[PDB]
Amino acid sequence: EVTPIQQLFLIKELKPGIARIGVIWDKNAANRDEVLPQLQRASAATGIKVVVAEVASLQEVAPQFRTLLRDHQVEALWVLEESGLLGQAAARSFLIKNATQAGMPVFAPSETWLKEGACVTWRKDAEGIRLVVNKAVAEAMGITIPAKYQDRTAFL
Numbered sequence: 001e002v003t004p005i006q007q008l009f010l011i012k013e014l015k016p017g018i019a020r021i022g023v024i025w026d027k028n029a030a031n032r033d034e035v036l037p038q039l040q041r042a043s044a045a046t047g048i049k050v051v052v053a054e055v056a057s058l059q060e061v062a063p064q065f066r067t068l069l070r071d072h073q074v075e076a077l078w079v080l081e082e083s084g085l086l087g088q089a090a091a092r093s094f095l096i097k098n099a100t101q102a103g104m105p106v107f108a109p110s111e112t113w114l115k116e117g118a119c120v121t122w123r124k125d126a127e128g129i130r131l132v133v134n135k136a137v138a139e140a141m142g143i144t145i146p147a148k149y150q151d152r153t154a155f156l
Contacts, residue, residue, distance in 0.1 A: 001124040004035055004080060005042040010129065011107055012046050013146040014120055015076055020049045022074035022104075024064065024095060026085045027056040035080065050078075061091050062098075069102055078107045092116055105141045114156045119143055125152075132156060 002010075011018065023039060025032070036052060043050040051072045053064035068074045077099040085091050086109075096117040099106050108118035114134040119141055121132045131145065135155040145153050 002122050002129060004038045005045060006129065007078070007080075007107070007122065008039075008042040008046050008048060008050070010122065010131075010146075011076065011078065012048060014107075014143050015105055015141075016144060018048055018075050020051065020072060020074045021076045021078050022065075022068035022072065023050060023052045023078045023080065024061070024068075024086065025052050025054045026081070026083070027054045028084050029081050030083070055085060058085065058088070058091055061085075061094055065095065065098055069098075074104065076105045076107060079109055079113070082109050082112070087112075100137075105138075105143060111156065127152065130154065 011021065039050045039052060051068055051074055053068050055061050055064050077095060079086055092113060093116065096106055100117060106113065106118040108114060108121050110121060111132055114121055114132060117137060119134055119138045120143060123130050123132065129152065131149050131153040133153055133155050
């Protein structure tokens with residue numbers, strides 16, 4: 001319900017100064033032909049370079065994440081859905097840990113990720129976007145809340 005471009009405009013204010021972000025995308029997720037071109041338009045619009053690494057299985061997760069970190073030097077990890085591989089505990093745990101140990105915040109699709117270490121997720125209420133924040137991790141990672149959302153932010 002929060003579109004990819006709305007999400008990346010939020011990320012721009014949550015981690016101000018970010019210039020490069022990494023997306024881990026499940027090759028078996030629905031809507032690749034919509035989402036993936038939308039990420040590239042979101043990148044041009046926001047000024048944040050978006051690099052996508054696609055994965056189909058758990059053995060692809062670690063090599064693809066290392067490509068995002070060493071070949072592209074991304075500053076955050078962004079996960080857009082969790083219907084399949086990215087809803088498994090092993091993949092979730094691996095991505096949060098290796099992101100955090102690289103100094104990268106994780107922007108995540110559900111509160112399950114927050115319960116395990118991810119920083120921010122989002123929902124769309126009748127009064128628009130509302131943020132859900134892992135207070136402990138977000139304070140350590142220097143996450144900042146845009147003024148418009150100060151009153152629309154819940155802590156886990």
